[PDB]
Structures are given as structure tokens and as C-alpha cells.
Amino acid sequence: MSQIGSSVRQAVSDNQSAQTLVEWENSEANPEALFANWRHEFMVDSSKRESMKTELCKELQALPAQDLTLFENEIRDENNRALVSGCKEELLAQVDEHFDEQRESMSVPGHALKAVQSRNSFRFPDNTQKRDMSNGYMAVRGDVARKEVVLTFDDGPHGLYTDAILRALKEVNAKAMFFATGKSVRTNPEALKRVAADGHVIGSHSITLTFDEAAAEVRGGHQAVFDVLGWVDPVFRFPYGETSKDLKAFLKTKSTGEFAWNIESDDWRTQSNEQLLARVLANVESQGRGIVLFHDIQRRTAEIMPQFLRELYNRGYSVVLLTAADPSAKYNSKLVKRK
Ligand SMILES: [Mg+2]
Ligand SMILES: [Zn+2]
């Protein structure tokens, strides 16, 4: 199996050795990238298909279940159906059994795959705060008060996990900001509509360039949201670590807020549910307030969301939604083409 096995082991290794999100973003063995390349190889040489399948299955089946979670989204992705058809059910049983075991030790269990009403029976107060985005806006902590946090979710919607996150938020009257990506929106428009219907803010996150190529990436995610909903909030998040002064100026000209964050979840890193809750809550406490970075495409984030929300409440934190001061801004984005 050596090249496929080497790449599988490399994904796991790089995920553990990365010190930051940006470093992990720099990996050459990101599972999404690995499977995009395998789909291409599979397409272009039919003589290699059966051996790719047997090898991929053997190498993924060799992983400990917790490590296998790194590849879960690729295994679930119907685009990869032919690659994993030989072992999909078995792999997903291993991952599902892992999250079953993880759930046992939680006082407020969640479930990313099915609709569960958690044990949460509290309600965060409404707390929506307006920001003038007409000549842009740079958010790090978002100008919120002590013990206020803004929950933000990148790269969705996912076909399953986002709805679990929505259920968790709704149960406790929490609102959030979603920075959707074009690819996810095109795959899952009905899920995006459910996010919209639950009162959340929805902007975009680009994913990869010359200035014009980068600007086109900024427009494209915004356009995808707009094409589904008839609006897109004037909020945008760069590809992590982007420093371009030109793109920052562009956003201001285009009356769109630029959202960074100050509270890391590290939810990109394979880890136990326990570890993830500990890291994100330690960072909430360390910072005291601000903007939290989650990914609604990360299963484990959906699994821990009810528990996370209960701990925010227990710890005296309140959830804030940031939104444009101009309620019409979402219908008149300078990043989208009408009609
Ligand atoms: Mg505004
Ligand atoms: Zn992202």
C-alpha cells in the first residue's frame, strides 16, 4: 500500500505535529486534498481502480478509530463513493462507535448524526449587537463586553453536522455567525436555508493567488450564499493567516466586515471530546471575551456543542450575535451580482 498508506499515515502525523491552524492548513496531506487527488488518479487510470480501493480500505481500516475520525468527512462524501464502497459501512461503524464511547462521559451529550434534544433547559438572553460595516469593519474581539462571546462557524454547511449545531444553538436561544464556503453551499443549499431560518448571520469564508484571483474567491462564496437565500450578510473571513493589505482595503471599499477571531477551539485537531471542550473553554476563560472559531464541518464540534453551551452558561458567559447596523446591507452586497 505504500503510497496511499504513506499519505494516510502522513495526514495523521501532520495533524498532530501542526502547532497552529495555519500550519495544518499548510499540510500536503490534508484529507480533502488527498481524496481530491485520489479521485483524479482513479478517474484517469481505470487499471489502477481496484488496487486503489483495496489499498485505501486496508490503510483506513488499520487506523485507530479516534484517528480514523480525521477522514470521516471524506468517507461520508458521496464524491468519494467509488473509492470507499468496499469498506464505507465498516469505517463509519468504527467512527460512530468511537463517538458513542465519547458520549458516555458527557453530562450533556450531543449527536452529530441524529436529532437529539439535549438535557439543556436554560436560555441565553437575546444579545444582538450592531456594527457599522459601510466602510468595512475589522473584528478580532468584536467590541463585545467582558464575558461575552461570539460563536462563529467556518466552512459549512455540512449535510448532517450543521443541523446538529443548529439544534444545539436553538435549544438555548443562542445565535451564531456562519462563514460558509461556496463548495459547501452548492452541495447543501437546503441546510443553508435552515441556518438562515434559525436567525443566524451568514457570510462567507474563502478557501485557497493574484489579487484578481483572490477577489474572485471572495466574491464567489458570497455569491453562492446570495444565490440560495436572496441575501448574504456583509461579513467575510479570509483564508487563515492572510495578510494582504490590498484585500483588506478591497473589503472596506466593498462595505464588508473582515472577521478574524481571538478564541481558538483547535477543533481541526484530532482529539477526544474531553480535550476539545477543555481547550476551547480554557481559551474562552483566558481571553475573557471575544470571537470563537469553530468549524460546523467538524463532527466533534457538533458532538460537544450542547456541552459547550452549558459550560459557557455555567461559567457566566453570554452569547452575542454581531450583525450589520444597516438591515438592508444583506440585500445589497457589493460582492454579488444581482439577478
Ligand atoms: Mg452596516
Ligand atoms: Zn476555513
Author numbering: 23 to 230, 249 to 379
From the paper:
Bdellovibrio bacteriovorus is a small predatory bacterium which enters the periplasm of Gram-negative prey cells forming a transient structure called a bdelloplast. We identified two related genes (bd0468 and bd3279) in the B. bacteriovorus HD100 genome whose products had homology to one domain of the peptidoglycan deacetylase PgdA of Streptococcus pneumoniae. Here we show that both genes are expressed early in predation and act upon the GlcNAc residues of the prey cell to modify the prey peptidoglycan structure. In contrast to early ideas of solely stabilising prey peptidoglycan; the modification caused by the Bd0468 and Bd3279 GlcNAc deacetylases targets the prey bdelloplast peptidoglycan for destruction at the end of the predatory cycle, and without it a “ghost” of prey- bacterial peptidoglycan and some membrane remains after Bdellovibrio predation.
We obtained a high-resolution structure of the secreted, mature form of Bd3279 (encompassing amino acids 24–383) at 1.5 Å resolution. Bd3279 is comprised of two domains, an N-terminal domain (NTD, amino acids 24–126) and the catalytic C-terminal domain (CTD, amino acids 127–383). The NTD forms a compact structure comprised of seven regular and two 310 α-helices, stabilized by a disulphide bond between residues Cys79 and Cys109. This domain approximately resembles a “cap” over the active site of the enzyme, and has no precedent in existing peptidoglycan deacetylase protein structures; indeed, the sequence of this region appears to be unique to Bdellovibrio and its close relatives. One of the active site loops of Bd3279 is at least partially disordered, with weak electron density for amino acids 229/230 and no interpretable electron density for region 231–248. The CE-4 ×2+ catalytic ion binding pocket is present in Bd3279, co-ordinated by residues His227 and Asp177; the third superfamily-conserved ion liganding residue would be expected to be contributed by His231, which is present in the disordered active site loop and thus not modelled in our structure. In-line with homologous CE-4 domains, we have modelled the ion as Zn2+, putatively arising from co-purification as no exogenous zinc was added at any stage. Unique to Bd3279, the NTD sits over these active site motifs, with residues Leu43, Val44, Trp46 and Glu47 projecting into the substrate-binding cleft; such proximity may regulate enzyme activity. In total, the structure of Bd3279 confirms that deacetylase activity is likely to be attributable to the same conserved machinery of other, previously characterized CE-4 enzymes, but with unique flanking features (obscuring of substrate binding cleft by novel N-terminal domain “plugging”; extension of active site by disordered loop) that currently appear to be predator-specific. Domain closure appears to have affected the position of two active site motifs, given that His231 and Tyr280 are in orientations incompatible with catalysis, yet we observe activity with the purified protein.
